[PDB]
Curated annotation (Swiss-Prot):
The protein's name: Protein phosphatase 3 catalytic subunit alpha
Protein's membrane topology: Peripheral membrane protein
Quaternary assembly: Forms a complex composed of a calmodulin-dependent catalytic subunit (also known as calcineurin A) and a regulatory Ca(2+)-binding subunit (also known as calcineurin B). There are three catalytic subunits, each encoded by a separate gene (PPP3CA, PPP3CB, and PPP3CC) and two regulatory subunits which are also encoded by separate genes (PPP3R1 and PPP3R2). In response to an increase in Ca(2+) intracellular levels, forms a complex composed of PPP3CA/calcineurin A, calcineurin B and calmodulin. Interacts (via calcineurin B binding domain) with regulatory subunit PPP3R1/calcineurin B.
Catalytic activities: O-phospho-L-seryl-[protein] + H2O = L-seryl-[protein] + phosphate; O-phospho-L-threonyl-[protein] + H2O = L-threonyl-[protein] + phosphate
Name of one Pfam family that matches: Metallophos
Annotated PANTHER family: SERINE/THREONINE-PROTEIN PHOSPHATASE 2B CATALYTIC SUBUNIT 1-RELATED
Sequence segments annotated as region (Catalytic): 196-480
Amino acid sequence: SYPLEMCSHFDADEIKRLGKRFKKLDLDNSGSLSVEEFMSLPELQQNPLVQRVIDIFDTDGNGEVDFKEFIEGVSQFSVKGDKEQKLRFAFRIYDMDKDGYISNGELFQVLKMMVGNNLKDTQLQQIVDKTIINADKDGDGRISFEEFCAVVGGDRVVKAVPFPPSHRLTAKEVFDNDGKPRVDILKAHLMKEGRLEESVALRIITEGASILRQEKNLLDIDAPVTVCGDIHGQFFDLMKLFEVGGSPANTRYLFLGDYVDRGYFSIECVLYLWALKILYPKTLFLLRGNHECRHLTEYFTFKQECKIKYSERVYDACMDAFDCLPLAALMNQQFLCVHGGLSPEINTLDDIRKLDRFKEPPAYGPMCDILWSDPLEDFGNEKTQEHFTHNTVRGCSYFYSYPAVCDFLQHNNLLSILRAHEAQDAGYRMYRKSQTTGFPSLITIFSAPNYLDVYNNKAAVLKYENNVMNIRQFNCSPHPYWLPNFMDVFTWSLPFVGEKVTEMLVNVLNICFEEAKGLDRINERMPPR
Ligand SMILES: [Ca+2]
Ligand SMILES: [Ca+2]
Ligand SMILES: [Ca+2]
Ligand SMILES: [Ca+2]
């Protein structure tokens, strides 16, 4: 019989109605909603967030929800009111102990509630860790309301998964007095998910680009050599790649491009290979692949990676570096080595030399073709296809045919073409043998094992030595987890939180194999200019 105080945006009629639904819900008519009383409703027991909502509503911390709390809670939705409330409510979902800070464990447990078994615990811990590292601007290891609002707008931890190092390597730690970089140390850090300093990275990028800028359009490379295909930001598989193909210190390398873009570790692949390039200028060689441009790195996630880690200057620096990448390689005077393949405008090796390479790749022309041309789908069984034909998979440059390749192999006195532009189940692919040489006219090489984490394909590299072209395959390796497009866990989870709380309240109305090559085709295309 004493009146009840509350602060809500409901009018007196709306409160009476909410009261009806409160009473019904209240079975034992104790005037307080209990955890079990909630978990008596048709669709409410299979909602991961009830547990949370109930506990936030419980302002007094007595375990149950009184009518005030109920009305005040529901009032904090359906608000239309200022955006701070929406944010303020969202924050409380994660902050289990109500102390105003989101703990690692807190963030882990709360996510773990809604994600269930769709993620392994090691994976979930990882994305929690990275989200915090980025979001935490004061160093305490927890997320304030302020830090939170910054991110969404635009003991106490579950170990033992390695936590990414806070220390950024300095110029002294990475470079020795003679100028050369410490691949030893670089690798150690990057594999730990560590980062360099914005200064150290920029130095590596530019110091390597300056070496590239001086190499010719068409390299001359001698056997023995290990030839590699696409890498696509799979840094952890690059480590394996080097283990399999031989140490860079005792072995010659030629990479045929695509270092970045489809994988979440592109910047690491770049820093590392660029570091190696400085260290072994005359024995380690990088070509340019179609993905090494401003146009594709904007479209896919590389630009995005550079912003999340480091700065946009690092991106801009890589773009200028990429411009210096050579287009091709004549290997042991037998093999033309190109990322993509031929051009109708490139008849001789001398044609490759006449090209101005220091620019963003044009949308057509010999440059484009070198980087995008693919072979015919039925290359070697051709029936009315001309040498070069409009490539409908890429949407630019040409498809080349077996006669086209054979023709070029004869005119320039070459044995075969090594390229890498198309994923391959076995990590490579040989094509029809030349009528005279008896050796494959064309070879694709692909060095990214288990591509996009789904193709479940083997990788490969070509080891040419003692007049044998040995194809060494390898399976993939573990790597840390990132949510698509380096999304922080809040941005990711919030929408699910939003949808599930609305469902909850609507209880209010109870009165009255590489087939993945098929899925990915869209992204095999040059983006829309
Ligand atoms: Ca009750
Ligand atoms: Ca209460
Ligand atoms: Ca807390
Ligand atoms: Ca903090």
